[PDB]
Design a protein around this ligand. Structure first.
Ligand SMILES: [Ca+2]
Ligand SMILES: [Mg+2]
Length: 223
């Protein structure tokens, strides 16, 4: 996350770190047995880490649970990143508490202008590499599809939205992939892609979760 701030330990209790020997993607806990992340984060051998703040120091509120199964969206296209969403079931149920909580799925899509919260352990420089060990946060508004489509002609589908600042300066970056974009108490997006980080007229692009609620509910209940 570039230009954001330190969230504070466990202030984003639904935030997950996917680890395959190191942190490689974020995710969101939607209930004790399931996590939603990005399909481009798919890997075999994932351990889900809950209640994290510093990812290199066991501070006491973590739960590390292995994944039993992963389900990438049936229509994920890794070339365009359309339908960039995946579900991860935990081998054991998490123990929800103040530090480990789930986030709600949306009932309707959010409007442009709505302020959201983006969080992750990704790169914090736009031009450089500095990976933080504690969770960083960024409040950013959803942009109009018009400004999103002008920035990326022929690349945005109805399953994507942009959030950020066209002036640049604040944005998600690598290491944030798969993490949450929460607006008004609901999980509305997933960090998917963008052009570099915090560049001018290049906002980050997010998976539009409100379009996958029936698929998520149907899939988790049948698995
Ligand atoms: Ca830790
Ligand atoms: Mg993240």
């Amino acid at each position: 996350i570039v230009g954001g701030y330190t969230c504070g330990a466990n202030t984003v209790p639904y935030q997950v770190s996917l680890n395959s020997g190191y942190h490689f993607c974020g995710g969101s806990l939607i209930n004790s047995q399931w996590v939603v992340s990005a399909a481009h984060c798919y890997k075999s051998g994932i351990q889900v880490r809950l209640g994290e703040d510093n990812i290199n120091v066991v501070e006491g509120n973590e739960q590390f649970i292995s994944a039993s199964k992963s389900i990438v969206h049936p229509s994920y296209n890794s070339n365009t990143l359309n339908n960039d969403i995946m579900l991860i079931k935990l081998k054991s149920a998490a123990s929800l508490n103040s530090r480990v909580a789930s986030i709600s799925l949306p009932t309707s899509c959010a409007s442009a202008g709505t302020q959201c919260l983006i969080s992750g352990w990704g790169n914090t420089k736009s031009s450089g590499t500095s990976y933080p060990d504690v969770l960083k946060c960024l409040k950013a508004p959803i942009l109009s599809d018009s400004s999103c489509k002008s920035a990326y002609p022929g690349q945005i589908t109805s399953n994507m939205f942009c959030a950020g600042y066209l002036e640049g300066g604040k944005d998600s970056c690598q290491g944030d992939s798969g993490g949450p974009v929460v607006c008004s108490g609901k999980l509305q997006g997933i960090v998917s892609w963008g052009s570099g980080c915090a560049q001018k007229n290049k906002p980050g692009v997010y998976t539009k979760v409100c379009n996958y609620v029936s698929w998520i509910k149907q899939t988790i209940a049948s698995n």
